[PDB]
Design a protein around this ligand. Structure first.
Ligand SMILES: [Cl-]
Ligand SMILES: [Cl-]
Ligand SMILES: [Cl-]
Ligand code: NA
Length: 124
């Protein structure tokens, strides 16, 4: 039974690569992180920075989350990310994703002690 912080790591961290270098990156990563078990998760972002750099965002710019909560933080610098989004021809169990690599600021919600990311809100 997964902690919120561990779920964030599984869904959103990929420090092992600097960027998505292939159109099939999302198909592979969404499957290997178990995000296509039982359903195709429609949208998911992977961050290509160290865990420490992503955890550090919880001490950066405090901003509102989309849902109105005030525990969101925007990274001061841009970060390498990959957005994964289901295509129109995707349907479980043959989930299919579009891969879009970008360099953007990330916005995360933080909670707990230690105070770490638990939700990926957006990128800018
Ligand atoms: Cl898992
Ligand atoms: Cl996401
Ligand atoms: Cl401020
Ligand atoms: Na947690």
């Amino acid at each position: 039974k997964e902690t919120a912080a561990a779920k964030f790591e599984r869904q959103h961290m990929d420090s092992s690569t600097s960027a998505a270098s292939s159109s099939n990156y999302c198909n592979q990563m969404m499957k290997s992180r178990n995000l296509t078990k039982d359903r195709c998760k429609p949208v998911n972002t992977f961050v290509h920075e160290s865990l420490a750099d992503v955890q550090a965002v919880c001490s950066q710019k405090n901003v509102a989350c989309k849902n109105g909560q005030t525990n969101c933080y925007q990274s001061y610098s841009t970060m390498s990310i990959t957005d994964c989004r289901e295509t129109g021809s995707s349907k479980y169990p043959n989930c299919a994703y579009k891969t879009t690599q970008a360099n953007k600021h990330i916005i995360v919600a933080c909670e707990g002690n230690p105070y770490v990311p638990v939700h990926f809100d957006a990128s800018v």
